[PDB]
Assembly symmetry: D2
Homo-oligomer: 330 residues x 4
């Protein structure tokens, strides 16, 4: 029988996760919890200003029908203690609200049938896994973190380039689309930079790169750091790695080491663009990272710059469900 | 009054004491406007923002630029002519007390008490008047230059919407010149904090959609609003709004059927004439072929686009006018505070 | 029964759209394209669009293009219309999409040998003008025609429908329009000092000859309708806004019904209705000349109504281009 | 000199006479900058725009706001300290004659003569010096505050790119403090007039794509540019640019490997220290947590983002800095004109 999952929270990642899971034959969405009215949640699933239209229907009994999940229960309960996925016999939760990004909080989902919780974000005191990077070290933990979108795109490249060349140090900048933690106009915010209109401004913003890499590539954590700059695009982001290696490198050798890993250890996770595309071309791309082959450069013997695209919504949502598949069986 | 005397203030020569409630877009702009009026003193601001964030947001604006503002050793703000602004942070209107700073008039800018019943909760001790920065249930409504002269000491009023402040003066002028039989109004409007940055939950499933990516039709009670300030015209006018991807500055589009015949010439004349007389400082004319960004921080309720006036079939005209939905409206707010404090 | 052999002149926005539309029409064969772009660049642009998405397109060994049902597209690169010879691929009809030959005199230069018919992707001086579903049945074998502007294609249907139902006494049009390649990215030289200003930052009023356009296709209504455009910071999809005075009384209900009805009958596949409260980005790539916004129809007094309608100013119009190519090849 | 005397000008006390060639973004900004320098006189502008359009574009800017400019009865422009600007409209550089107005120095802002050979065609009679508003083949290159003191009377010079004016000072300061071993540079850059509004033909198939919708990686010759102004560092630095949907204001991102050990503290100290001394008026520090729009019209070649400096692994640092790619660069252009007119 398909793996029975429930989606908690229907903002950006919630909506993407639904749409991704709906296209996986080996998955069944049995429930969704949404603070949106039912009709609104349907509307939002169907119609996206960035990703386009999607086929979704309502059954007479007021369940949703989307691709291979034909009987989705819809719930609307903010309080996690009253929320009961058991009712639909959910095995695994993808937690997408942003309000329970900790081990303590998200454990509350574990009840009758519910045995596993994947958090759509970094999470306090929470074992953290990134498909293709350290996911094979999964050992039946009941509550995990799928990390940030930026780690899913950065950690692969770091692994690959470390295994090929040994990373001594690296600096990361992510040029990131604006997300719902930002403001439409200049108003109150706990961060006085993200207070400012997202669509008008370049907005530097601190992001815990060292800590993130520590969880999934511990030997590299103390050697890598960086930051983010939020920019006026609605989706699709760009990671910019500046790396110092132990072994000498060239444009050619870095290119080769990346292409090779896309054929082997990172098939379906990392890709290469040779066609000189731009951000909008990666809307809805399933990859954790698409390397920008023609812009790879080196300087001196040991240093290189590597760029890669990632759809911070869909790429990550693909990985969410990939990981659901993976931990349902292992 | 003893608190006035203790601070060396003479109540008889005193500037008009106002407090600003809410420090979002309109609160912020109202602060900036009032700070530059010599006859006004902002004596208190209530803000859910951290103090230092409030300061920051006053000082720096992605659209409007930089503003001089300081913080005094005692945690009061110092901006222009308002050197001792008490800052509060109390969401509960019943616990909030602007009497402490001897506020006469409240500029209500939260968007949460847009009703006679709700905003009346402000009235205590020194506080006698309340101007709501939006349309408001069961609330006497005034628009500067349209019907503000009918004001008769009401203790809680509404300053209408930004669109009504732009549309009503135009409607009045053109009605008095040509008699409006009917009119349809579209406002092409900058996006506001009423909207969403990305596609997510909202009670209106249009405004649920990403504000910076979409044209977004949206219903707005034109007939009702006009009824309040120009009652004869209320039954004759209606319209809607389209939110578009600009952060500020909006455009009102009037398509009018008149009783008397018109030309482009005669419509231009009637509008310019009114800008010199009954609407000096409220309505203006643009003859310089400007675009939306040129009107950032314009003080006018409306700026007519003189070259794009068109008429057809003897009786019909299209009239466009710019307005800075934030600063023009805020200018009127404080104009109204000056007005109701004295008259 | 062999497919109608067409060539596309110019590969900017409409050119690219027209290629992609025609490529999906079984009854059409694109035999040639003329492009000032390098071949590889034209291919790149056909394949990848920041608004409309990816498109399957290939290059054959011989350096022809292969796209859907047009498998051998000759690719030319000649700017001078006199030296350009579409006869070499046996083209019957030209879709003129450069913007540089929008007149009878100029575009006539395409007529040689196999080439008998020219559809201009824009208004055109002294040029018989036709709008699918509006006056296209009055086509009488003219060899050079105009497919009007994108705004006329969206406005004229609505005007016809509402006229036939209620008798239009007067109407005023505003189109809230996406920016197009006649605008500037930043504040710089332009013959129109409003379109000189940065397109992505500004609301930009701009003069559009509505009366004249409607005169060509709905002559009785030309002297009764006029309006203007406001260019706005969106890359595609526009919005027409009609304020109408009628002879016969109307209601929200009656205007709605008259419009729904015409979508089922005289304007099937040309006009549509949205009842789902969508917004602009939802109509990206929509094939319709006009999608009425049902819920926002309003009336005031007895005789007056406002009507809004969406239109993808690129694709909607490009659909109509090829519709008209089909229509004049046979009639 | 006879034309000077006829107009009541004393050649021995006169302001430095410059002419501006091309009135796109940098031309326009250069006009506004120079107009406000008392030691400068703009004596001529050559513009492909219609005169009245040029005036309009000087006066009104969607990003930079409004500017005072007048047209004199005789068809000369009158802006700040430059009251009799001759306006020309001649695309052919060999027919253009800035001698007519007794220009000493040409600011070359068309983007079409970025080479020693091409721009030399300016040199006739009174015109002795040419500053190219871009990198330029076979052209001595100078960046104010980096190597401008090596200037030795060259008649044609390049003011480098906007990115080199921001990057080079930072590289110099940090090199002199810590020795740069290597560095990688990304510039997140506002879109410019070499890009497309919509997806259409371009020589670079990335810049072919809509500027307002896309992040657009783009190759920029960093090593070559640094080589010219800081030769020891040329072989040690490289990088690229990413064009993004903002109309103005850009961000340079340096990732540096040093010989001496560093901390956030020590990098901050070295940068601030330089801003007080060797780079007063050229480099600055932002301690106020600002964003891109706050630096519109900033005069500095670079503004360091003090709070976002990071270091790791003893030797490595990230350093960000804002720059207004239009006004910062334009400020330097005219600083250089002042400099080479005298030294
Ligand atoms: N690119 C990305 O978006 C991205 C990538 C990776 C990770 N993440 C992470 O994903 C999390 C969510 O981000 P997002 O992009 O999806 O933001 P979002 O669009 O704001 O999604 C959060 C949604 O959760 C809803 N919600 C909050 N509390 C709820 C509850 N108790 N029950 C049900 N729904 C609830 C909110 O609705 P209300 O308004 O009703 O509260 C909101 O619509 C964050 O931790 C973020 O860091 C995001
Ligand atoms: N163009 C315009 O923007 C415009 C023009 C004319 C009229 N108006 C109207 O004026 C009103 C204000 O709009 P706006 O654009 O300024 O909205 P806004 O930017 O969202 O500002 C509203 C602010 O009020 C605060 N607030 C809410 N409840 C509060 C309370 N109890 N005490 C103190 N502060 C509170 C909110 O802070 P929290 O987020 O912490 O709750 C928010 O920062 C609305 O009704 C609007 O329609 C707007
Ligand atoms: N929404 C719309 O875009 C829309 C809708 C309806 C009608 N139209 C009309 O369609 C026409 C074109 O609009 P558009 O948006 O497609 O224009 P565009 O995006 O500017 O593209 C026009 C193209 O024509 C090319 N061109 C010019 N002269 C040529 C020649 N002699 N041979 C071959 N190619 C040539 C140009 O190439 P170069 O760059 O090499 O000069 C350019 O790429 C205009 O009249 C416009 O009004 C547009
Ligand atoms: N932030 C920046 O934009 C920036 C910063 C530093 C350096 N630069 C460099 O400075 C140069 C100018 O850039 P920009 O942004 O100002 O570009 P721009 O906006 O395209 O300005 C160049 C102007 O020169 C005009 N022109 C072309 N040939 C001419 C001629 N023969 N005579 C007179 N005018 C002529 C063009 O008008 P027509 O359309 O009539 O040809 C155009 O308006 C470029 O090389 C650029 O890379 C730019």
């Amino acid at each position: 029988m398909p793996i029975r999952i429930a989606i908690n929270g229907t903002g950006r990642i919630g909506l993407c996760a639904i749409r991704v899971a709906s296209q996986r034959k080996d998955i069944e969405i049995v429930a969704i919890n949404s603070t949106a009215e039912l009709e609104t949640l349907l509307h939002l699933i169907r119609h996206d200003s960035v990703h386009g239209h999607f086929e979704a229907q309502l059954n007479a009994d007021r369940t949703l029908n989307i691709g291979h999940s034909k009987n989705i229960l819809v719930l609307s309960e903010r309080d996690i203690n009253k929320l009961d996925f058991s009712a639909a016999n959910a095995e695994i939760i993808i937690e997408c609200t942003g309000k329970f990004n900790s081990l303590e909080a998200s454990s509350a989902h574990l009840k009758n049938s519910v045995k596993k919780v994947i958090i759509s974000a970094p999470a306090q005191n929470t074992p953290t896994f990134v498909y293709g990077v350290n996911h094979k070290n999964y050992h039946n933990e009941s509550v995990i973190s799928n990390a940030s979108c930026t780690t899913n795109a950065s950690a692969p490249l770091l692994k690959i380039l470390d295994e090929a060349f040994k990373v001594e140090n690296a600096l990361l900048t992510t040029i990131h689309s604006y997300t719902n933690d930002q403001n439409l106009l200049d108003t109150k915010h706990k961060d006085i930079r993200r207070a400012r209109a997202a669509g008008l401004n370049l907005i530097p913003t601190s992001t815990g790169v060292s800590k993130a890499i520590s969880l999934v590539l511990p030997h590299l954590g103390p050697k890598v750091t960086g930051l983010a700059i939020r920019v006026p695009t609605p989706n699709v982001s760009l990671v910019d790695l500046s790396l110092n290696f132990k072994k000498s490198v060239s444009k050619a050798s870095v290119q080769h080491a990346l292409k090779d890993a896309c054929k082997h250890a990172f098939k379906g996770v990392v890709s290469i663009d040779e066609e000189r595309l731009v951000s909008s071309d990666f809307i809805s791309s399933p990859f954790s990272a698409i390397v920008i082959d023609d812009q790879i450069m080196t300087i001196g013997e040991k240093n290189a710059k590597v760029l890669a695209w990632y759809d911070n919504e869909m790429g990550y949502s693909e990985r969410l469900i990939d990981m659901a598949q993976y931990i349902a069986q292992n």
